[PDB]
Amino acid sequence: KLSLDELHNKYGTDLTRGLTNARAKEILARDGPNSLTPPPTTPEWIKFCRQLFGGFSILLWIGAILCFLAYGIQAATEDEPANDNLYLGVVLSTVVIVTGCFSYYQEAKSSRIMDSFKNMVPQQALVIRDGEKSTINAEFVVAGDLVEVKGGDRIPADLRIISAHGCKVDNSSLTGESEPQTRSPEFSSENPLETRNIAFFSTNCVEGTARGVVVYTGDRTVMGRIATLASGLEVGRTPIAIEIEHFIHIITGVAVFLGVSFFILSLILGYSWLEAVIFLIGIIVANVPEGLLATVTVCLTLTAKRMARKNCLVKNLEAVETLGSTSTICSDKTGTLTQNRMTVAHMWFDNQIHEADTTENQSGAAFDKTSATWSALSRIAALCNRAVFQAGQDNVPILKRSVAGDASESALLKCIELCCGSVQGMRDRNPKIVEIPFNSTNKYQLSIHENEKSSESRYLLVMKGAPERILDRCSTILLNGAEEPLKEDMKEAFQNAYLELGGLGERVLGFCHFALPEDKYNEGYPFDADEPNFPTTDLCFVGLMAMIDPPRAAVPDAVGKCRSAGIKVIMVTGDHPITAKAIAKGVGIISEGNETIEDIAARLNIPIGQVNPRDAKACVVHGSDLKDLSTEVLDDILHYHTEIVFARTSPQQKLIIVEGCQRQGAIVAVTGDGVNDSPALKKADIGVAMGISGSDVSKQAADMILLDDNFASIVTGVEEGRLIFDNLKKSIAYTLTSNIPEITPFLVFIIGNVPLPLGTVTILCIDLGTDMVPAISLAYEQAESDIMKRQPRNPKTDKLVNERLISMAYGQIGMIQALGGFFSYFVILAENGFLPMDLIGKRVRWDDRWISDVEDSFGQQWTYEQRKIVEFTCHTSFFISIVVVQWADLIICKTRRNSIFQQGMKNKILIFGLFEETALAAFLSYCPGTDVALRMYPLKPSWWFCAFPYSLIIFLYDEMRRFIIRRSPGGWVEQETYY
Numbered sequence: 001k002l003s004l005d006e007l008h009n010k011y012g013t014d015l016t017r018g019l020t021n022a023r024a025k026e027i028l029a030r031d032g033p034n035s036l037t038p039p040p041t042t043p044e045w046i047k048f049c050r051q052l053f054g055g056f057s058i059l060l061w062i063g064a065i066l067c068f069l070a071y072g073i074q075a076a077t078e079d080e081p082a083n084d085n086l087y088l089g090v091v092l093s094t095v096v097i098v099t100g101c102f103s104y105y106q107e108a109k110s111s112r113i114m115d116s117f118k119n120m121v122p123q124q125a126l127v128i129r130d131g132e133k134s135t136i137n138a139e140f141v142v143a144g145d146l147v148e149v150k151g152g153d154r155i156p157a158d159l160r161i162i163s164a165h166g167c168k169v170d171n172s173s174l175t176g177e178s179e180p181q182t183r184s185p186e187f188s189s190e191n192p193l194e195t196r197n198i199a200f201f202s203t204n205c206v207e208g209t210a211r212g213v214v215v216y217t218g219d220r221t222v223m224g225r226i227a228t229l230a231s232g233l234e235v236g237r238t239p240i241a242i243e244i245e246h247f248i249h250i251i252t253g254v255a256v257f258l259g260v261s262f263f264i265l266s267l268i269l270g271y272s273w274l275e276a277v278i279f280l281i282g283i284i285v286a287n288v289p290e291g292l293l294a295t296v297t298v299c300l301t302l303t304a305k306r307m308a309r310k311n312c313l314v315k316n317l318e319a320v321e322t323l324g325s326t327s328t329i330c331s332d333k334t335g336t337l338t339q340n341r342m343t344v345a346h347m348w349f350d351n352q353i354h355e356a357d358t359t360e361n362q363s364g365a366a367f368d369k370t371s372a373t374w375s376a377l378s379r380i381a382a383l384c385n386r387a388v389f390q391a392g393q394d395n396v397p398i399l400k401r402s403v404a405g406d407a408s409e410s411a412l413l414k415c416i417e418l419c420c421g422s423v424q425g426m427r428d429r430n431p432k433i434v435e436i437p438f439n440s441t442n443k444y445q446l447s448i449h450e451n452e453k454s455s456e457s458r459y460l461l462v463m464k465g466a467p468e469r470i471l472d473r474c475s476t477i478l479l480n481g482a483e484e485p486l487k488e489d490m491k492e493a494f495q496n497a498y499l500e501l502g503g504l505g506e507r508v509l510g511f512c513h514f515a516l517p518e519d520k521y522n523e524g525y526p527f528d529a530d531e532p533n534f535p536t537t538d539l540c541f542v543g544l545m546a547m548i549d550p551p552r553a554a555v556p557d558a559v560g561k562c563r564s565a566g567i568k569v570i571m572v573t574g575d576h577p578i579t580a581k582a583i584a585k586g587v588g589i590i591s592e593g594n595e596t597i598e599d600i601a602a603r604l605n606i607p608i609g610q611v612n613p614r615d616a617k618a619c620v621v622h623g624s625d626l627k628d629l630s631t632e633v634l635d636d637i638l639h640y641h642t643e644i645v646f647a648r649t650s651p652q653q654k655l656i657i658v659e660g661c662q663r664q665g666a667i668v669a670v671t672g673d674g675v676n677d678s679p680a681l682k683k684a685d686i687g688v689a690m691g692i693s694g695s696d697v698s699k700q701a702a703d704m705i706l707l708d709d710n711f712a713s714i715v716t717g718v719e720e721g722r723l724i725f726d727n728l729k730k731s732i733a734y735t736l737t738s739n740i741p742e743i744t745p746f747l748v749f750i751i752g753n754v755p756l757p758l759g760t761v762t763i764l765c766i767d768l769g770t771d772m773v774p775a776i777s778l779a780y781e782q783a784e785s786d787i788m789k790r791q792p793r794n795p796k797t798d799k800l801v802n803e804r805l806i807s808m809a810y811g812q813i814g815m816i817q818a819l820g821g822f823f824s825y826f827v828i829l830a831e832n833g834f835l836p837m838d839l840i841g842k843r844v845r846w847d848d849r850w851i852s853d854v855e856d857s858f859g860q861q862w863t864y865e866q867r868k869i870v871e872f873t874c875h876t877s878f879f880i881s882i883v884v885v886q887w888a889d890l891i892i893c894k895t896r897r898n899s900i901f902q903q904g905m906k907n908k909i910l911i912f913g914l915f916e917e918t919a920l921a922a923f924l925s926y927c928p929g930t931d932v933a934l935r936m937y938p939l940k941p942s943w944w945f946c947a948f949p950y951s952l953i954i955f956l957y958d959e960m961r962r963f964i965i966r967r968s969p970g971g972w973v974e975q976e977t978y979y
């Protein structure tokens with residue numbers, strides 16, 4: 001409740017010139033940037049407690065405790081003790097600590113990449129300083145400068161409106177509004193939230209433009225004080241995540257069951273009540289998989305960084321998953337399929353077609369520049385146009401300089417300045433009284449100006465728009481200079497002119513004008529843009545103007561890739577069916593051979609109504625028909641046609657098309673740029689907002705932001721989206737297989753009563769060696785040459801962890817790695833004197849420190865450490881047999897449909913993994929001192945080879961398993977083993 005003078009007098013500011021740059025910076029440095037402050041958080045404290053002290057590591061923390069107590073009771077009691085317990089503790093503790101560090105290096109990394117994408121797409125406001133308009137980062141606005149807003153932009157700070165032009169804002173988020181409340185410079189209510197002279201932070205200007213003085217800036221804002229609570233914030237979990245958990249749950253159920261069973265088995269065989277619970281605890285711990293979620297989050301984060309490099313920024317991680325399943329792409333034409341770099345090619349007037357483009361000069365012998373009709377046409381183009389040359393281009397040529405405005409008005413303005421002269425004087429020659437702006441629902445632009453004829457003081461009215469609309473507003477024709485009527489002979493010549501200019505892939509516009517009678521509208525009468533002050537019809541059409549706009553380079557290949565993937569492409573444009581059909585013919589939306597109902601009518605020379613609608617695979621639906629249609633008809637066109645093009649369509653229509661596409665049961669992505677798109681951009685599954693030309697509304701409302709506005713960028717993004725899935729399945733498949741060889745020894749040991757084949761140190765060696773680096777390498781895998789040549793996926797029918805993964809890992813591949821390790825075990829014992837038949841039952845006697853007389857097969861007598869040494873030589877051999885079989889499992893994991901001979905060994909990280917593991921096994925087995933500390937003994941050379949036959953069998957099996965897939969689709973193998 002103040003005035004414009006009191007406001008400018010309190011903060012200090014010129015209503016017509018704004019602040020000065022020096023003063024602006026003085027205030028910018030005086031009170032801090034216009035950005036909210038970060039909220040409270042848990043530091044590394046709660047970050048490390050969850051890592052080193054979580055749920056699975058806790059058990060290891062116990063193993064370490066127990067062992068230390070085992071050493072203390074020893075050194076305090078027994079003279080000259082042993083040290084296997086002290087080094088066991090020193091080894092276990094080091095494992096919990098490392099696992100924690102690795103996980104930390106991963107949790108942070110993701111938290112940081114997401115923060116980077118927030119500054120990729122910042123917000124830049126429009127401020128007026130020293131009398132000039134400039135777009136600066138929202139973080140540089142201060143209190144006092146002048147700020148201008150336009151329908152589609154976001155209010156930067158708390159403004160005090162000083163001048164508005166039918167400006168409306170969306171005040172729903174702060175409070176609870178719905179409809180657009182209009183912002184007027186006058187004051188209306190005592191409550192600041194109800195008055196219209198104040199713009200607010202985080203609000204958006206729906207329609208109109210306005211000016212205002214920044215009253216409040218930075219945290220000193222309404223939503224800033226409210227943010228006390230906001231600080232917390234909220235996030236989410238992708239589908240995949242709630243898929244993994246589910247799995248984990250089932251497995252836990254299977255694991256708990258088996259535990260109780262192993263319990264009854266132990267007691268029916270005479271174990272100690274305590275030994276049965278020790279077994280239940282161990283078995284349930286060995287059946288539940290560990291790591292699944294960390295690898296899912298890391299894989300997604302890494303893929304997003306891959307996508308932002310290829311021009312596709314994702315507002316969240318759920319978008320990374322939805323992009324792959326994409327079935328339909330509803331794309332627009334001017335901006336996506338094209339470049340918006342249009343240029344006038346053919347002009348129509350005096351029933352004649354005229355060419356142009358006088359090579360940045362006055363040559364080309366286009367048309368007499370003297371033509372009267374041409375003077376009228378050149379004048380309306382130069383007058384109704386709203387664009388203007390960017391300041392300071394007095395040096396560059398007429399075609400290469402910079403302009404501000406629609407691409408249509410820019411092509412028009414340049415043609416008129418090259419072969420027609422300076423527009424600023426042409427614009428002052430005639431004074432602009434009242435102007436009405438363009439719109440997609442109107443489809444025309446009009447304005448009235450004074451007439452510079454010093455002998456005629458009348459009023460001139462000019463309007464341009466889609467040639468069809470303008471034709472319906474004319475009853476005369478400016479012909480050869482005079483006027484004539486629009487009868488059918490020239491009406492048909494005009495129709496054949498639309499197809500001549502249209503088939504050329506050119507954009508066409510209509511231009512007409514009329515002399516308002518100064519007797520019914522005097523020089524003093526003001527024609528406010530409210531009611532019918534101008535005769536819409538009875539105008540004088542002067543002539544058409546056509547311009548070319550080419551498609552992007554990569555676009556033809558993109559549509560081809562979509563067709564091979566099993567993806568439908570739809571073009572939604574505001575132009576004419578001819579230009580639509582054409583662009584479609586070029587990009588590839590409408591491939592060769594397919595015809596429409598009109599094409600068949602033309603070939604057969606039969607009425608269009610007689611032709612069968614099912615006979616045509618492709619169709620071009622207009623807008624009037626779409627408005628008149630119900631729902632079953634829409635489903636008919638969407639289901640029966642393969643290539644559907646939509647021409648002449650308002651924005652309020654897009655939603656009907658999207659609802660039709662979802663009714664079928666398909667995932668859709670839509671490309672949007674304005675305000676009327678926000679509704680559509682929310683209902684669809686993937687909202688693609690333009691980065692270059694979009695508005696704050698389109699970006700806030702969508703899931704993704706296209707950085708280059710290229711249709712080609714998208715298809716590449718979907719390729720990146722499918723690869724995530726493929727690699728995730730491969731990695732999980734590689735991780736779950738080692739579970740079988742680690743559990744089978746503890747089973748035969750208890751049931752069959754033989755010496756323990758795998759122990760605690762060796763098992764930890766397997767998990768950390770063959771499951772960490774090789775697994776990570778898999779993420780980096782390339783794409784098989786089938787990724788785009790395969791149908792999309794139905795999330796309901798196809799899941800990540802299904803009953804087939806467990807079939808290949810546990811059942812087929814696993815059991816083989818187990819047999820491979822059992823051979824190296826049997827071989828080591830038989831050679832050292834203990835044969836296989838004699839081994840069943842020796843455990844009871846084997847594990848007794850007191851029987852130094854153990855007798856072997858050849859009849860020799862063994863002490864306690866002499867036989868324990870051979871057992872340890874078996875733990876080490878098992879280990880190596882596992883790395884050897886892992887070689888094979890890893891190679892076969894690279895591809896699931898193609899061979900490795902086809903895919904190739906170009907992955908460097910995977911190789912690194914093979915050589916490094918081999919090195920770890922050779923190093924630990926041969927180093928001089930592991931004996932004392934880790935309990936691994938040297939392996940003789942004839943032993944390393946025991947696992948080789950089992951490693952070749954796995955590779956050959958998977959190779960054939962695949963050949964049969966490639967040859968017989970939908971067969972038994974694909975139904976059963978394709979995960």
Ligand SMILES: C=C(/C=C\C[C@@H](O)[C@@H](O)[C@H](O)C/C=C/C=C\[C@@H](O)C[C@@H]1O[C@H](C[C@@H](O)[C@H](O)C[C@H]2O[C@H]([C@H](O)[C@H](O)CC[C@H](O)/C=C/[C@H](C)[C@@H](O)C[C@]3(O)O[C@H](C[C@@H](O)CCCCCCC[C@@]45C[C@@H](C)C[C@@](C)(O4)[C@@H](C[C@@H](C)CCCCC[C@@H](O)[C@H](O)[C@H](O)[C@@H](O)[C@H](O)[C@H]4O[C@H](C[C@H](O)[C@H](O)/C(C)=C/[C@H](O)C[C@@H](C)[C@H](O)C(=O)N/C=C/C(=O)NCCCO)[C@H](O)[C@@H](O)[C@@H]4O)O5)[C@H](O)[C@@H](O)[C@H]3O)C[C@@H](O)[C@@H]2O)[C@@H](O)[C@H](O)[C@H]1O)CC[C@H](O)[C@@H](O)[C@H](O)[C@H](C)C[C@H]1O[C@H](/C=C\[C@@H](O)[C@H](O)C[C@@H]2C[C@@H]3C[C@H](O2)[C@@H](CC[C@H]2O[C@H](CN)C[C@H]2O)O3)[C@@H](O)[C@H](O)[C@H]1O
Pocket residue numbers: 062063066067069070071073267268269270271272273274275278279281282283285286287288289290742743746756758759760763767
């Ligand atoms: C950290 C862990 C925890 C521990 C770790 C541990 O290892 C180590 O840290 C150590 O702790 C280190 C700690 C050291 C601490 C300190 C030390 O430093 C210091 C030194 O320690 C030394 C000790 C140390 O030297 C020791 O030796 C260490 C070992 O300890 C364990 C030993 O074995 C054993 O404990 C020895 C100790 C002693 O023996 C204990 C005895 C009992 C306590 C108790 O009985 C004695 C006594 O009686 O207790 C009394 C107290 C009472 O209140 C208690 C109340 C009793 C309740 C009764 C109810 C029972 C119950 C319960 C019901 C639920 C069900 C039910 C059926 O039974 C039901 C039925 C009722 C109706 C029964 C009623 C019975 C009544 C009984 C009671 O009344 C009492 O007995 C009674 O009151 C008594 O007083 C009385 O005397 C009674 O006597 C008799 C009773 C009978 O005896 C008794 O009842 C009997 C027999 C029952 C029998 O079951 C009956 C059967 C026959 C049956 O009925 C039968 O007939 N069947 C006939 C069938 C038949 O015909 N069939 C014919 C078929 C025809 O068709 C009599 O009968 C009764 O009448 C009479 O009343 O109710 C009281 O105090 C006294 O009385 C006392 O004497 C073993 C270990 O713990 C340890 O090694 C000390 O000597 C020394 O002085 C000290 O200085 C977690 C574990 C790990 O997770 C796991 O890995 C684990 O490590 C492995 C499993 C190890 C195994 O493998 C190792 C090698 C490698 C492994 O590590 C590998 O890692 C394995 C892994 C595992 C998994 C899988 C896989 O493999 C791998 C995969 C993982 C991979 O996947 C991953 C992915 N996620 C990635 C990767 O990791 O992980 C091996 O080395 C291990 O050896 C091996 O085990």
Ligand SMILES: CCCCCCCC/C=C\CCCCCCCC(=O)OC[C@H](COP(=O)(O)OCC[N+](C)(C)C)OC(=O)CCCCCCC/C=C\CCCCCCCC
Pocket residue numbers: 744747748752815818819822836837840
């Ligand atoms: C829980 C999941 C486990 C997964 C794999 C577990 C691997 C376990 C494999 C073996 C462990 C059992 C212990 C074997 C010891 C049995 C000894 C035996 O058997 O002594 C019989 C013969 C020895 O004859 P000799 O020459 O000394 O007699 C000479 C006679 N004179 C001279 C008088 C003419 O030994 C033979 O013939 C060959 C016997 C050698 C081993 C055969 C064991 C059974 C056969 C295949 C097992 C693999 C099954 C795979 C299943 C996949 C799904 C689970």
Ligand SMILES: CCCCCCCC/C=C\CCCCCCCC(=O)OC[C@H](COP(=O)(O)OCC[N+](C)(C)C)OC(=O)CCCCCCC/C=C\CCCCCCCC
Pocket residue numbers: 899901902952956959960963
């Ligand atoms: C010290 C340790 C050394 C370890 C040595 C390991 C050796 C390897 C072990 C076994 C190898 C045999 C496995 C054969 C399995 C069948 C593979 C198969 O059927 O692949 C089919 C592919 C055809 O694909 P496509 O036409 O659909 O591609 C289309 C591409 N697009 C789309 C671009 C046109 O064929 C191809 O890629 C052509 C590739 C041909 C490769 C032939 C290899 C066989 C030669 C000897 C094998 C060893 C025999 C016994 C050895 C005992 C050794 C001591």
Ligand SMILES: CCCCCCCC/C=C\CCCCCCCC(=O)OC[C@H](COP(=O)(O)OCC[N+](C)(C)C)OC(=O)CCCCCCC/C=C\CCCCCCCC
Pocket residue numbers: 785887888891900901902903904905906911914915918948951952955
């Ligand atoms: C004694 C018996 C033992 C039996 C044990 C069995 C062990 C496991 C059995 C087999 C596993 C090894 C199989 C190796 C496969 C070689 C396949 C190959 O050669 O396919 C030729 C490729 C294709 O080329 P392209 O241009 O047509 O592809 C065009 C690709 N598109 C279309 C996408 C552009 O060419 C390329 O990949 C480029 C050249 C890559 C050369 C890779 C050489 C390294 C191979 C293995 C490394 C050793 C690891 C073990 C470490 C332990 C050592 C101590």
Ligand SMILES: CCCCCCCC/C=C\CCCCCCCC(=O)OC[C@H](COP(=O)(O)OCC[N+](C)(C)C)OC(=O)CCCCCCC/C=C\CCCCCCCC
Pocket residue numbers: 091094765768769920927928929930932933934
């Ligand atoms: C990637 C992760 C996968 C695997 C991770 C495994 C984590 C394990 C972490 C730590 C384990 C530490 C083990 C400590 C090594 C032994 C220390 C020790 O407690 O030794 C005690 C022995 C004394 O035995 P004694 O007197 O009873 O023997 C009597 C012999 N009689 C009587 C027959 C003559 O000491 C001796 O023998 C003297 C020999 C000293 C041995 C020097 C070897 C250096 C050890 C590690 C350095 C290697 C790092 C790798 C760098 C790679 C660079 C590219």
Ligand SMILES: CCCCCCCC/C=C\CCCCCCCC(=O)OC[C@H](COP(=O)(O)OCC[N+](C)(C)C)OC(=O)CCCCCCC/C=C\CCCCCCCC
Pocket residue numbers: 941942
């Ligand atoms: C481009 C870069 C490629 C890199 C590939 C991987 C690099 C491989 C690196 C090293 C491998 C060579 C190992 C040579 C070691 C010989 C040392 C030796 O003196 O050893 C003697 C033993 C005989 O022991 P004994 O029990 O009779 O006497 C024991 C007598 N006492 C115990 C009383 C002393 O003999 C043995 O260990 C035999 C040793 C094994 C023989 C090698 C056979 C493999 C040959 C080629 C396969 C290479 C894979 C490439 C595949 C490419 C496919 C596209």
Ligand SMILES: CCCCCCCC/C=C\CCCCCCCC(=O)OC[C@H](COP(=O)(O)OCC[N+](C)(C)C)OC(=O)CCCCCCC/C=C\CCCCCCCC
Pocket residue numbers: 949952953956957960961964968970971972
């Ligand atoms: C140390 C040893 C190292 C080497 C070991 C090598 C072991 C690997 C050997 C073979 C791999 C076994 C893969 C198992 C898959 C067989 C499944 C099968 O039965 O699938 C038959 C399919 C039928 O599909 P469908 O759609 O008509 O079914 C319609 C079904 N309904 C009517 C119900 C809808 O395909 C057909 O019938 C026609 C296709 C038949 C393909 C036969 C492939 C034989 C290839 C190699 C075997 C020879 C190895 C020689 C080595 C000598 C070693 C001593």
Ligand SMILES: CC(C)CCC[C@@H](C)[C@H]1CC[C@H]2[C@@H]3CC=C4C[C@@H](O)CC[C@]4(C)[C@H]3CC[C@]12C
Pocket residue numbers: 062066274281
């Ligand atoms: C699920 C996990 C964490 C439970 C671990 C239980 C541990 C603490 C239990 C399992 C078996 C127990 C041992 C069983 C037998 C004996 C022998 C006795 O003369 C001293 C205690 C001692 C050595 C016990 C100490 C505690 C012990 C090691």
Ligand SMILES: CC(C)CCC[C@@H](C)[C@H]1CC[C@H]2[C@@H]3CC=C4C[C@@H](O)CC[C@]4(C)[C@H]3CC[C@]12C
Pocket residue numbers: 744803806807810811
């Ligand atoms: C350690 C040993 C004894 C365990 C042996 C486990 C074997 C028998 C288990 C491991 C994985 C299991 C398979 C997992 C999935 C399926 C698919 C289902 O539609 C039919 C059963 C089938 C094919 C299972 C059969 C039994 C199976 C092969």
Ligand SMILES: CC(C)CCC[C@@H](C)[C@H]1CC[C@H]2[C@@H]3CC=C4C[C@@H](O)CC[C@]4(C)[C@H]3CC[C@]12C
Pocket residue numbers: 827942943945946948949
């Ligand atoms: C392609 C297929 C059929 C070939 C199978 C070859 C079999 C028979 C070969 C492959 C590796 C071989 C083993 C390699 C190493 C040793 C250690 C030695 O001290 C005793 C023999 C023994 C245990 C061999 C026995 C025969 C063996 C198992």
Ligand SMILES: Nc1ncnc2c1ncn2[C@@H]1O[C@H](COP(=O)(O)OP(=O)(O)O)[C@@H](O)[C@H]1O
Pocket residue numbers: 332333334406408409438440443444445464465466507508509573574575576
């Ligand atoms: N400034 C303008 N004034 C009048 N008509 C225009 C203007 N710009 C474009 N047109 C024409 O009006 C119609 C509506 O265009 P629009 O809704 O933007 O569709 P598109 O997205 O295909 O350009 C098109 O035929 C277009 O050629």
Ligand SMILES: [Mg+2]
Pocket residue numbers: 332333334335673
């Ligand atoms: Mg558009």
Ligand code: NA
Pocket residue numbers: 290291767771
């Ligand atoms: Na693990």
Ligand code: NA
Pocket residue numbers: 681682683684685686687703
């Ligand atoms: Na959405």
Ligand code: NA
Pocket residue numbers: 733734735736737738886889
């Ligand atoms: Na594996």
Ligand code: NA
Pocket residue numbers: 735736738739767771
């Ligand atoms: Na594992």
